Amino acid sequence: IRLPAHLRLQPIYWSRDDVAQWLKWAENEFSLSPIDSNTFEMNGKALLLLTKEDFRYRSPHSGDELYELLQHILGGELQRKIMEVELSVHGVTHQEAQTALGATGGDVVSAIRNLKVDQLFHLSSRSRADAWRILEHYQWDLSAASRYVLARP
Ligand SMILES: [K+]
């Protein structure tokens, strides 16, 4: 039906109060069994990281419904992807994560690798093929690849 204010923002901006308000909205809109407000004590970012099994454990009556709503109706899937990209590539901005996912078609794996080469390339005068060499050499661990180039004699 109609989503309330604040619930219209992306889930990554949902506060812990917004999440409780979301649960209330879904309960009334979908005639769910009463959901205790202390069932998801976390903000919208955390919410996106729970698995479907986690939603079922926390709400046996409605967990799977809530997951599908959040992830596949309210845009949770893309926001989980951008958050994984941003957290897998230190130094990446949120806007940059969105841009890289779009540039790879929602392929999280390609987007992370593309940003890792960008980040390592940014640390020195070495070329992009040099940065690729060090990343491949270090099994795409950006932390170790970075320290290799920073600690050269
Ligand atoms: K590029």
Curated annotation (Swiss-Prot):
- Assembly information from the UniProt record: Interacts with the SH3 domain of PLCG1 via its Pro-rich domain.
Domain of life assignment:
Eukaryota
Q: Where in the cell is it found?
A: Cytoplasm; Membrane
Q: Which organism is it from?
A: Homo sapiens
Organs and tissues of expression = Expressed in all umbilical cord blood, bone marrow and adult blood cell sub-populations and in several leukemia cell lines. Highly expressed in fetal blood, brain, lung, liver and kidney. Detected at lower levels in adult prostate, testis, ovary, small intestine and colon. Not expressed in adult lung, liver, kidney or brain.
What functional role does this protein have? Involved in negative regulation of cell growth. Has tumor suppressor properties. Plays a negative regulatory role in the Ras-MAPK pathway. May function in signaling pathways utilized broadly during fetal development and more selectively in adult tissues and in cells of the lymphohematopoietic system. Could specifically be involved in phospholipid signal transduction.
Question: What taxonomic ancestry is recorded?
Answer: Eukaryota, Metazoa, Chordata, Craniata, Vertebrata
| PTM comment | Autophosphorylated on tyrosine residues.
Q: What is this protein called?
A: Non-receptor tyrosine-protein kinase TNK1
